[PDB]
Design a protein around this nucleic acid. Structure first.
Ligand SMILES: Nc1ncnc2c1ncn2[C@@H]1O[C@H](CSCC[C@H](N)C(=O)O)[C@@H](O)[C@H]1O
Lengths: 285, 150
DNA sequence: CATGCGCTCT
DNA sequence: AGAGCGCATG
């Protein structure tokens, strides 16, 4: 009689380990979490915030089929490739096939190496995330390689910021409606620290660019504080993304560094929304 | 057994008859962007699948890697079953249009280091499951596993 | 039409 | 560190 086992996760392009974070928040017992990252700051954040639980590997393109076979079978395979060559926010983007774009295929590739062989009836879940603001050609091509259509989820519905994102995958109930939680902070005001007034209810998509915090045409300061207008503090921004307070306060990072990490990141309530039914498929802690 | 071949980005039908593989059993696609798995399966199981980059100095909108990735895609589409009914081979050819980075990506994806074949700076590279004239010698050995219509 | 998981250049 | 550029695109 099959019992539920702790989950085995391969995380490509792991960033600040949003996956493991969400998984732990859902109370899902994690057998192993193998992450592929190359940015030392991000790897530091993952290392510190999850106390060496994360087994790190180098470049994703240094991971081979033999490694997948050797690192045990994987219950879950999640990844979001860099979008600096995909997003239309970058005028000088090199597309899906040049630059960092081709790294998507590295996910693709590895997915098929990790996919349980035919005649294997074990549960296999995978999730690939990227931006909506990408060219139609690239989107179509990604859909053709992953043989699926994406699901648009916007963090506006569940957080204090706009984050329209495409999600390819096969997680149960990806298309189900999002639902706010008592823990969710939907208005920017709810994210601010004490003594600070928010000019906005929602903020526009936060990139790695510092002035993505500026709102609309006239580049308005998002907050006002004691006779002086101000931008978001890193803690407030963390709260906006749904991360626990002071999550990215490591490795003596400047505002720009932290924001560089967070701008590339996932919206925690969204990933929680996606991983939510998994707690019924694996052992709970 | 007779011929069953899938040709990509180039047509070797003219060469297939020349080396003795023709008898209609060849399929050829130029734009494979809107080709699904079912489209590959419905064309009958293929014994050999070919694809090659256009000779450099030819005109192409696509990046050098596009050909490789599409080839790998349709290749995974074309492979049979865990059980092995018959012989199945694949071949990808670079006309020296692949960047060092891109050919490294090729070697990474096809899980094989390319064999380089010279003309006599007019050479070509190839990734193949095999155990113009000079590489026609590479088109040759298939005759042992598949009947030739001479 | 307003917008963007960015780069560049001080 | 912060302002400008960029324009296809939903
Ligand atoms: N070649 C490569 N191999 C592995 N990771 C890479 C890589 N190139 C870039 N990356 C990493 O991939 C990440 C994609 S941004 C996604 C971060 C993550 N999904 C999060 O929620 O935070 C970047 O942070 C970058 O550091």
């Amino acid at each position: 009689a099959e019992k539920r086992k702790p989950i085995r996760v391969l995380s490509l392009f792991d960033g600040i380990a949003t996956g493991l974070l969400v998984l732990k928040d859902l109370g899902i017992q994690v057998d192993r979490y193998i992450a592929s990252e190359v940015c030392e700051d991000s790897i530091t954040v993952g290392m510190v915030r999850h106390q060496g639980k994360i087994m790190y590997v180098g470049d994703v393109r240094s991971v081979t089929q033999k490694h997948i076979q050797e690192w045990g079978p994987f219950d879950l395979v999640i990844g979001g490739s860099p979008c600096n060559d995909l997003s239309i926010v970058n005028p000088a983007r090199k597309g899906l096939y040049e630059g960092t774009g081709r790294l998507f295929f590295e996910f693709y590739r590895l997915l098929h190496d990790a996919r349980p062989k035919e005649g294997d009836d074990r549960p296999f879940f995978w999730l690939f995330e990227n931006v909506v603001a990408m060219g139609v050609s690239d989107k179509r091509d990604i859909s053709r390689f992953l043989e699926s259509n994406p699901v648009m989820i916007d963090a506006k519905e569940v957080s204090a910021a706009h984050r329209a994102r495409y999600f390819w995958g096969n997680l149960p109930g990806m298309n189900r409606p999002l639902a706010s939680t008592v823990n969710d902070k939907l208005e920017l005001q709810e994210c601010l620290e004490h003594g600070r007034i928010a000019k906005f209810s929602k903020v526009r998509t936060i990139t790695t660019r510092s002035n993505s915090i500026k709102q609309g045409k006239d580049q308005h300061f998002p907050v006002f504080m004691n006779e002086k207008e101000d931008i978001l503090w890193c803690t407030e921004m963390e709260r906006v993304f749904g991360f626990p307070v002071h999550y990215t306060d490591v490795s003596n990072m400047s505002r720009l560094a932290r924001q560089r990490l967070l701008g590339r990141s996932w919206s925690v309530p969204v990933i929680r929304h996606l991983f939510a039914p998994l707690k019924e498929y694996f052992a709970c802690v | 057994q007779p011929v069953r071949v899938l040709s990509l980005f180039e047509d070797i039908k003219k060469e297939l008859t020349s080396l003795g593989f023709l008898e209609g059993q060849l399929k050829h696609v130029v734009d494979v962007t809107d080709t699904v798995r079912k489209d590959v399966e419905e064309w009958g199981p293929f014994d050999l699948v070919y694809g090659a980059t256009p000779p450099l100095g030819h005109t192409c909108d696509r990046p050098p890697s596009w050909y490789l990735f599409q080839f790998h895609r349709l290749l995974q589409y074309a492979r049979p079953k865990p059980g092995s009914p018959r012989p199945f081979f694949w071949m990808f050819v670079d006309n020296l249009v692949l960047n060092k980075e891109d050919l490294d990506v090729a070697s990474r994806f096809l899980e094989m280091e390319p064999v380089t074949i010279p003309d006599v700076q007019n050479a070509v590279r190839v990734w193949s499951n095999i155990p113009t004239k000079l590489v026609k010698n590479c088109f040759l050995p298939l005759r042992e596993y598949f009947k030739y219509f001479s």
